[PDB]
Write a protein that binds this DNA or RNA. Sequence first.
RNA 1: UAGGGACGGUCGGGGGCAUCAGUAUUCAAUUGUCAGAGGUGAAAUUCUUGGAUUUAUUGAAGACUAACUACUGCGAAAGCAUUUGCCAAGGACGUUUUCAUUAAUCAAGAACGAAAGUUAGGGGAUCGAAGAUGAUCAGAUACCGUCGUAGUCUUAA
Lengths: 134, 265, 118, 175
Amino acid sequence: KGISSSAIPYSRNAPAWFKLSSESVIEQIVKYARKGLTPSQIGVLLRDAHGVTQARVITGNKIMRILKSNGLAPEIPEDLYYLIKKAVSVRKHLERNRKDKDAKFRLILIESRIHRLARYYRTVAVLPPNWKYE
Amino acid sequence: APESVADFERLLIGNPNSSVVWMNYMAFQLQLSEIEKARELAERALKTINFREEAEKLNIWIAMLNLENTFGTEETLEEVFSRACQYMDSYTIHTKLLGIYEISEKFDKAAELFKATAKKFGGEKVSIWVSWGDFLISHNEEQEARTILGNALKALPKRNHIEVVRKFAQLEFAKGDPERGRSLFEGLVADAPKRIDLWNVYVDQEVKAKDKKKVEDLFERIITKKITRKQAKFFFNKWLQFEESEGDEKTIEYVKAKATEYVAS
Amino acid sequence: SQVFGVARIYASFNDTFVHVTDLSGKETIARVTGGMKVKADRDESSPYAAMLAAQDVAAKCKEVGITAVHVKIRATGGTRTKTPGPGGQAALRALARSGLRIGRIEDVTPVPSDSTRK
Amino acid sequence: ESSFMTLFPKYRESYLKTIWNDVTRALDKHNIACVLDLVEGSMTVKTTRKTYDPAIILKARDLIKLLARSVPFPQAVKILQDDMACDVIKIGNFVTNKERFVKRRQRLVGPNGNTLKALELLTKCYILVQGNTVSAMGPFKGLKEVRRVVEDCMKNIHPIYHIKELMIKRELAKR
RNA sequence: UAGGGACGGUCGGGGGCAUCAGUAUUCAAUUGUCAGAGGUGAAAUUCUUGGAUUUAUUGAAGACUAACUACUGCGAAAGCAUUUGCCAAGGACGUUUUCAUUAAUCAAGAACGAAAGUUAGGGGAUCGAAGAUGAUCAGAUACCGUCGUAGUCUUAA
């Protein structure tokens, strides 16, 4: 296992070269999010093109809260959603070449990693019970 | 029943994974002159079926393949087999393609499918040998059938080639040549000289093909042969049952006489 | 001025072959395989048998007309020893000593190229 | 006219530079020339006009590839006489897993080298187990015996069975 | 400088399917030539004047991936080396992307496979593939139900 992540600066301030408005960020966020784009992609595009550092610093609060306050919420959280679609992609690939045992083993891993944050989200009650992995 | 593009979709709310009902609805749409909605139903049957249940997806693939072999196209049957390969093991998918070709009565496509089996699965195991024997037996050339079976048995291992030879002899007793069946039976009893598993196979195949004077005499030789009391009494009782089915009471008694001769030593 | 055969000598263990075809290889001339000049059934791979076979090979090559020989020396190859036996040196030494000109040494032993033993 | 060539690994050049004059004296007695290139890392050997033994280019080829395959010069020069030849046994394609392969190869080497040294004494050969092959110099009976002991050592049977039966066959051929 | 997820350029002989290539080996056909050729410490069984062995031209088969190949790589392990394409996957790194404790260790249970059956004597009580018996379906040796051989039991290789 390796140390590969991001290093948030010591500053909680606006970067002082950032002349752009502290509301048009939120309008750009809701533009991308209601043209249908996941929050990690919102944050990275807002970083790359309309360059913000991260929007929790420049706006009031973090962007999943911005989407929830702008009425733009996800049905299912993002991590669980991508793990669901990876599990169903490898399941379609398995119901295909029934001899990829290796993919069978890693389906065991992906489902065992579904259940961890699924029961986390149940105990926090983000998405409700009577959600039993289809 | 559910046999349309509206009523089937409305009535399939209870069992979406209905493989046989989806196949019947697709065949009813194709008889109802809707090949597009028929193929849509045949493709969405495996999608409305579960993911881990591979047999339902293979059944939907066989349904689309049968619809393509009846009133479709060979490209759709190959998609159905690629679909079969996308629903199951590739050798079973190609064997389903060979079965659809045999149902569509294409002799050249059946021989090409048996050859594509007899290369890969022919070097793997003996199922391609059985498929080649089936194709050439339906083509009525038992010489070419035995040659392809021996070639595939040389390509595959020879430890199951004894049971393959016994199956070839039983098939030859069923729908081939009886002298060739008896010759393959003698070859199998030679390759298994220590096992009477070929002797009882030869006796059962001859009694099934109504060779009573063959089956009861060979089983009497096996019962009076180098066998134990149980191994003698089983073969002698089978030979006596075959001799009483033919109508030979004194021969059925002499079978038990040879059993009593071999059990006491 | 020289006319060329090709030696195609084969120095296996347990035997040596001298088999001098024409330049294509389709038409053979003067095969005198070792184990026939002198045979104790052991000395068939010996340098003495190889030089006897090469000397009467060169006799028949001179009576046909071949004055020079491209020589191809082949070991037993395959999934086996791959090195030439005792007779491969002695055969072409005797072919050179007995008046016949030698050209183009090359090894055409069958290197098996990822062979079959499992 | 004939020419052969091997190319040798870089770490051998300080040794081959030392023994190269002795190579030139051991091949100029057979009237055959040879260069070694230090910038491409090769050893080529050419038949000159003054060469009357045609088979000696093959033994010179075997000599320079033995100098490639790392066998000492006074060990290597014995190719130049007639009752001596090379063999390169291939051992890598017998067994699957690395653990059993290196254990059977170390079994071919021996505890303290005793199996390999006793095999050299019995077969009258020079044997180098190296990497995933086994090189050998010797007479042809010794090459035949070393090929059968190595190819049967990669199968399960212990090579000291072959050392025992070689001692039995020597003192059983001494009558 | 806990954990998870996204992205990016990738990395690998990780896996599955399909494709392609290689030269050996074996067999067959066609010649050329003749008496021997395997194999061994010697021999022998075997192959052989409807011509072997060798040589040349092919064709077919089943494998296998020579060197390059390394105290190198990948995989959870067993293990994995030809090309190309597809299918998903994985890891390290980069990150001023996202969630916010979602975490660590191991009692049952499983997919895996390195993971097995080399020849012979003997007991068969049970079970029993192979073989056969009646209905299901345009099509059913499986399904249901039995007779029944080796084997399932043992000993050395």
